[PDB]
């Protein structure tokens, strides 16, 4: 774990075991850990994409780390998906663990599928970012974003470093997940990975431009004209 140092507003990285006499550390308050979002690199943030970057393994314990500051997220997720047999696919969050508090669009996902045993670990080993903490696994019903953690040494300086989209999973990861976008409990639109969080809201706004929720069992799934 290298420590970056910001010097003259320039990021340089110091060797861990070097006698770097240019680095002056008068207080532990100069040492910070920062959680960064996987948005910075342009990676897609839609639901199928997120599902495809997650997976499971049993026999490996979860690990948790703390952080001081982080990036604002445009997108985050809240997963509470049940197993096909009715049990949960995910563990309970530990006491003191709360979801990520700084997100514009959350993709809340439920529904069902044939979830394997083990923990829901990130495919590239990225951490799930939670409220001032991060961990290697996904917890049930807890909001999180995906990210990485950098460690910095700061000079003395003063830098200081919403809506819900509801989706329903179907067979969760077995080749494909037949996700539906929920408009109401009866009205669904089959999800297609072209629709951004903004398009989904705009589509929802249009649907209720001349409408409202009513009552019972229509259970109709709509497709978008591909044009």
């Amino acid at each position, epitope marked *: 774990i290298p420590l970056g140092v910001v010097h003259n507003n320039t990021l340089q990285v110091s060797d861990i075991d070097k006698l770097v006499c240019r680095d002056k550390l008068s207080s532990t308050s100069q040492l910070k850990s920062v959680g960064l979002n996987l948005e910075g690199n342009g990676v897609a943030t839609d639901v199928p994409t997120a599902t495809k970057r997650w997976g499971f393994r049993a026999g490996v314990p979860p690990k948790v780390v703390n952080y001081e500051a982080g990036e604002w997220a445009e997108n985050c997720y809240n997963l509470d998906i049940k197993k096909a047999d009715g049990s949960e696919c995910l563990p309970e969050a530990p006491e003191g663990v709360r979801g990520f508090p700084r997100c514009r669009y959350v993709h809340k996902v439920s529904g069902t599928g044939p979830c394997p045993e083990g923990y829901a670990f990130h495919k590239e080993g990225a951490f799930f970012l939670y409220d001032r903490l991060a961990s290697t696994i996904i917890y049930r019903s807890t909001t999180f974003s995906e990210g990485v953690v950098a460690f910095l040494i700061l000079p003395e300086t003063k830098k200081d470093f919403t809506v819900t989209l509801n989706y329903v999973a179907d067979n969760f990861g077995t080749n494909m997940t037949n996700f539906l976008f929920q408009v109401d409990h009866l009205t*669904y639109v089959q999800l297609e990975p072209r629709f951004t969080p903004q398009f989904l809201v705009q*589509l929802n706004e249009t649907i209720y431009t001349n*409408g409202r929720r*009513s*009552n019972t*069992t*229509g*259970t*109709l799934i*709509w497709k978008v004209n591909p044009t």
Partner: antibody
Amino acid sequence: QVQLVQSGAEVKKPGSSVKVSCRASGDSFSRKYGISWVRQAPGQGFEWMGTIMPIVGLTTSAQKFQGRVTITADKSTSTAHMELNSLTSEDTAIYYCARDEIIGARPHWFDSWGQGTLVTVS
Amino acid sequence: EIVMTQSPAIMSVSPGKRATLSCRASQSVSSNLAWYQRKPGQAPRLLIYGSSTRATGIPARFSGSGSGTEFTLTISSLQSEDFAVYYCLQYYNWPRTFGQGTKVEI
């Protein structure tokens, strides 16, 4: 409601496609009503095929026509269109257009309905 | 998904008599039904919707009521101009359904 206007009847060789259309009046209908279609095969009532919500450009259809009938419309003229591909003898029917209050996924009906037109083969 | 039947297939109504159409759903939907008048060769016209509410331009002679799965539609003093096939449409769920209609003969 609108004046529902339908295209002329025709006979194709089996396996051919028919483009069925209804250039009904009503611009406001793009947000107030779905464009709906049925297939009234001889001896049958008004079997549901599908419906369009032009303000969203959203569509839905019966499983019976998946891979067989394209459901669309020209939003600027409010003209309903269908592509009855690989048309067969079992598709002999009077095809009709109508205006059903926006559906979402709740209970709905039309007050008006067109005269429809015959589409058949051989 | 919803299910509706046809009953009677044909009803005999001398003009001036009250005609009856019997709509029997498999679902408790008497509040989500619609009835249409279809003259031979003509488009069906909505007469009544929901339960008993009349459609625009429909004579008072057209009336009906129901509860749960069943609704009875009647036409008081049915006239020559009303010898139409009357259809029971159920619009409660998707796919929507219908009876095949009741023909009326003198």
